[PDB]
Nucleic acid binder design. Structure first.
Ligand SMILES: Nc1ncnc2c1ncn2[C@@H]1O[C@H](COP(=O)(O)OP(=O)(O)OP(=O)(O)O)[C@@H](O)[C@H]1O
Length: 536
RNA sequence: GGGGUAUCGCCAAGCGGUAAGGCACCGGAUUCUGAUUCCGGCCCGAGGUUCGAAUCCUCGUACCCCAGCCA
């Protein structure tokens, strides 16, 4: 699987510019990982292992205020669950606070940084606009000695938040807004989840990232398009300090998925306002969310592989994702039987009850063996599989016609019974005793009512009603009210041996898995990962 | 103003020499899952250089990103 980045790497390896590849995944611990991060993970860890190099996991913990320890734990969990391993110990940008501080001092001594006292509002007014250039701060020309003294003052906590900041001295007229004296350090009297209260000054992203990459020996730092302008500051910092290597940044387009949101702020909001059970709600585009929904690490790696790596903005269709999980489960998931919308079907022609039929664990893979499924007179079938009268297109069960039960005989509808609402409460039928192993075209699933197992089924759907929910003025007001719908049904007996993690394919229905969060020893709960491809 | 992008369902190969593949959708074969499997259907605009242009050049047009003491 190739892309413009792997081609850049091949070239460097050929020209001799590098003899090894070292990448990194640098997530900020301010939320859980989503399918978007997965693309970055596959790209970075995938390149490393393919080129026999290294890939680091570095928490970019530069803003204590919006970060929490809870997130570092789940992020590590998901990277591992995805099947990737990082080189060495988990790293943290905060592991470099002392070096970063020393580098700030180097820039100050070269006259390439200074302490600015412009207020947070003033800095915006002096910055200029997209069409107009900015103007130099009145403090831009302080002497080295004065900046040194003032920066130590900031570190010591002598300045209140927003009363001072260390800025790089570049060019207020640069067409690159990011190069208009970017803030390097800002004051925050906030406790840090790694360094506690040792620091009241914290380095900004642009100053931190490139130096962190450099120190770790990163050869190619891969990020998304929104940082293309930043690459100039990334290079400016490395070009102006004393450091032996200069990692190069290459940007690719972020993944966007139809009918869902990918921004951490929006996903957080959904969780905070309780519109979803939690970061791992089965309807969330998060890694943990997809996991609980029934997606396999393998399907996700396949997905990331299929969508490619380019510099083109894109929004992949949900159909693309679902395809990957179907392909995965259609080859490894054992087949079973279950009815989501139950309706009794009495075979009056059946003598009492008691029988056991052999059902394959996979209609295309005998190697998976076969189970022992029971068959009786009173069974359960899905209401959708029966109709009093229907076109020739309806291949299911109809009064006059006869159907075939999955891996069983061939029954024939006879009479029906309804309640005081017209709802069929029971379907009476009869069968052909000799059909174990006319032209009855049609097959439906079923669950012997005697050996039946009460089971709760959770059917999920798109979280939002529109393709691009993030583009709506209020993405919340566009949430799909039917994203989750609980159903009570019955499944064959061999489904009580289901363990959270195992994926079954309820024939004619789709792929499901046990939901440990709701599944009780009494009543099991199955999440529908995805429906089966359905089209007459 | 600067940075990027465009192979017309959604992605995406291509790097001067007969325009891949995946998803989606549409046909047909197999089928005791309306599944699966297997066949088949499917170069932003205008010029210019060139024997030859999706690939190079010029000028456009459309879209995305940048005016946090966020990342
Ligand atoms: N949607 C995405 N597709 C591919 N990579 C992504 C995506 N979102 C974030 N990344 C990248 O993954 C790495 C870690 O991202 P980070 O932890 O900073 O979250 P983030 O940038 O806040 O994500 P978001 O902006 O989507 O909330 C960075 O390189 C980031 O650019």
């Amino acid at each position: 699987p190739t892309n413009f980045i792997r081609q850049i790497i091949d070239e460097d390896l050929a020209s001799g510019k590098h003899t090894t590849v070292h990448t990194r995944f640098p997530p900020e611990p301010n939320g859980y990982l989503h399918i978007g991060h997965a693309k970055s993970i596959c790209l970075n860890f995938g390149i490393a292992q393919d080129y026999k190099g290294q890939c680091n996991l570095r928490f970019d913990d530069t803003n204590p205020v919006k970060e929490d320890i809870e997130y570092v734990e789940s992020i590590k969990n998901d990277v591992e669950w995805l099947g990737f391993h990082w080189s060495g110990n988990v790293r943290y940008s905060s592991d470099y606070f002392d070096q970063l501080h020393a580098y700030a001092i180097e820039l100050i001594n070269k006259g390439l940084a200074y302490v600015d006292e412009l207020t947070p509002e003033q800095i915006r007014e002096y910055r200029g606009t997209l069409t107009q250039p900015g103007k130099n701060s009145p403090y831009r020309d302080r002497s080295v000695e004065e900046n040194l003294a003032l920066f130590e003052k900031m570190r010591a906590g002598g300045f209140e938040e927003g009363k001072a900041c260390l800025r790089a001295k570049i060019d207020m007229a640069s067409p690159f807004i990011v190069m208009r004296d970017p803030v390097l350090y800002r004051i925050k009297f906030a406790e840090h989840h790694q360094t506690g209260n040792k620091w009241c000054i914290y380095p900004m992203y642009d100053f931190t990232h490139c130096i962190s990459d450099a120190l770790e020996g990163i050869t190619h730092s891969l990020c998304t398009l929104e940082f293309q302008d930043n690459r100039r500051l990334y290079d400016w910092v490395l070009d102006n300090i004393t450091i032996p290597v200069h990692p190069r940044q290459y940007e690719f387009s972020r993944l966007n998925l139809e009918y869902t949101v990918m921004s951490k702020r929006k996903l957080n909001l959904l969780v905070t306002d309780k519109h979803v059970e939690g970061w791992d709600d089965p309807r969330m585009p998060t890694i943990s969310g997809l996991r609980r929904r029934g997606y396999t690490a393998a399907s996700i790696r396949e997905f990331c592989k299929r969508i490619g790596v380019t510099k083109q903005d894109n929004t992949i269709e949900m159909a693309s994702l679902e395809s990957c999980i179907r392909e995965d489960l259609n080859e490894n998931a054992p087949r079973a039987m279950a009815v989501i919308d139950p309706v009794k079907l009495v075979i009056e022609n059946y003598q009492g009850e008691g029988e056991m039929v052999t059902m394959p664990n996979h209609p295309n893979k005998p190697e998976m063996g076969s189970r022992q499924v029971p068959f009786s007179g009173e069974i359960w079938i899905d209401r959708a599989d029966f109709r009093e009268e229907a076109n020739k297109q309806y291949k299911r069960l109809v009064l006059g016609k006869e159907v075939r039960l999955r891996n069983a005989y061939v029954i024939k509808a006879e009479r029906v019974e309804k309640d005081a609402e017209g709802n069929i409460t029971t379907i009476f039928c009869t069968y052909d005793a000799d059909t174990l192993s006319r032209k009855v075209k049609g097959v439906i699933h079923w669950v012997s009512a005697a050996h039946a197992l009460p089971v709760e089924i959770r059917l999920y759907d798109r979280l939002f009603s529109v393709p691009n929910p993030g583009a709506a003025d209020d993405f919340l007001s566009v949430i799909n009210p039917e994203s989750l719908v609980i159903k009570q049904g019955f499944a064959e007996p061999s489904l009580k041996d289901a363990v959270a993690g195992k994926a079954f394919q309820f024939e004619r229905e789709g792929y499901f898995c046990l939901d440990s969060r709701h599944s009780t020893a009494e009543k099991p709960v199955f999440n529908r990962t995805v429906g089966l491809r359905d089209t007459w």
